[PDB]
Structures are given as structure tokens and as C-alpha cells.
Symmetry: C3
């Protein structure tokens, strides 16, 4: 269901190992399918986690930009130019949708 955090990944991962145990001991077609249904369900929760992390990175970028502005308004420099370069580069290579 709705994603609550990384602990969701653990509970689906550990349940994934439980299904694997049943598989190695008592193989069966229905069980191979069961394990695949579980992997899918596990992957859908991994995507949500990565999605949320990507949005967090985007928000962090905006905060870093505002910090640069505040630093420029306060102290007016070489380091400031260096930071803006990194932020530009990060903006260019940022993982997004």
C-alpha cells in the first residue's frame, strides 16, 4: 500500500526471503509465481522510496541555491563563484523524473 519509509522495504525484503525458503525446500510452479508476485511488490516499494529520495534531492538543491544568495547578500567572492559552479553542475547531472 502507501509508502511509509525504508522499513517497508525491509519487511517486504524479509518476507521475500521467507518465500525463497519455501521455494528451495518445496519447489512448485505456484510457488515460483508466488515468489515473482512478491518481487514485483518489493520492487514497487523500492521505486516509491527512490522517487521520494529524488524529490528530496530536488528540494535540497533549492535550499542550497537560497544559501548561496544569502551568502552573497551578506559577504558579497572566489568561493561563492566556486559554489555556484558546483550547484550548476549538480543541477545538470541531477537525477530527476
Amino acid at each position: 500500500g502507501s509508502h511509509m519509509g525504508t522499513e517497508d522495504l525491509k519487511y517486504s525484503l524479509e518476507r521475500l526471503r521467507e518465500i525463497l525458503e519455501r521455494l528451495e525446500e518445496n519447489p512448485s510452479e505456484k510457488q515460483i509465481v508466488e515468489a515473482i508476485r512478491a518481487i514485483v511488490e518489493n520492487n514497487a516499494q523500492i521505486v516509491e522510496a527512490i522517487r521520494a529520495i529524488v524529490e528530496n534531492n530536488a528540494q535540497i538543491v533549492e535550499i542550497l541555491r537560497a544559501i548561496i544568495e544569502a551568502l552573497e547578500a551578506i559577504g558579497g567572492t572566489k568561493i561563492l563563484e566556486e559554489m555556484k559552479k558546483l550547484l550548476k553542475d549538480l543541477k545538470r547531472s541531477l537525477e530527476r523524473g
Copy 2:
């Protein structure tokens, strides 16, 4: 985080997929599933390390805003950074 264990896991999974496609067998299917579970293990671990590192980044951002406030006081930029940071805190990926 570190990604070698991830790529090392994915490459093995890739090769295992090759055999299964070549000689579809129950043992090879199970061998592939075991590899996927192991790949998802490194994935989930790498995601956990990114989340914990973000949490510390959020804390460093808080200290930064304080260091800026101690030097400069009330600015529109500060209300902006704080409002932004609060929105990042409400939506941070957590446990």
C-alpha cells in the same frame, strides 16, 4: 553510499539470467530468483545508506540557517530557507 556491491550483484544476476534463458530449468529459475533477492538486498541497503545520509544533510542545513541567522539576523531569504527546510522535513524519506 558505495555501489560496487550493487553493480557486482547486478552483473552476476545478468549472467544467471543468460543460463536460464539458454536452458530453462527449475534449478536455474530458482537460482535466478535467489540472485534477484540478493540484488534487492544490496539495493535496499544502498537506499538505506542514502536515506541516513540525507537525514544528516538535513541537520547540516539546519545548522547552516542558524549560522546565517547569527551573522545576519532577520532576512526574507532566511524565512525562505526555513520554510523550504520545513517542507523538506515534512516529506523526507525516513524509516
Copy 3:
């Protein structure tokens, strides 16, 4: 083929869901390998996205590293000393 962003995971995951529905309705050895194939594809996009995020993480830490420098040159401290510790831990992790 070429990783373009998290939208790639969403699409491949949806293909993977689609391959599952057929597998479950009418199982067979063909669809099983089809499903696994799609899992490896989705996992590959996932690893790529994660690899890019870890890269972003490194660049962010550098920007914070340069900021703390800028703060030191401007205002001389405890909070900076505190910020240097958090960063050191974070730099150690990566």
C-alpha cells in the same frame, strides 16, 4: 537503453506488472522467464537511478563543504565546529 530518470523505473515496473498478470492467469515456463527478464530490466534501471543518486550525494556534500568554508571566512565557532563534525561523519560514510 539510456537512463533518463525515475520515470524509467515507473514504466518498466508497469511493464513488469503487465507481464505478471498474464503469468498468473495462465502460468507456463515461457511467461516465467518473461517475468524474470522484466525483473532484471527493472532492477537495472533501479541500479542506474541509485548510482546517479549516490553521485548527486557526493556533489551535495562538496557544496556543503564549500559553504562551511565561506561561513568560516565571514564570521570567524561552536556551530561551525558542530557543522564540521556532522560533515566529517557524512564524508566518512561515502
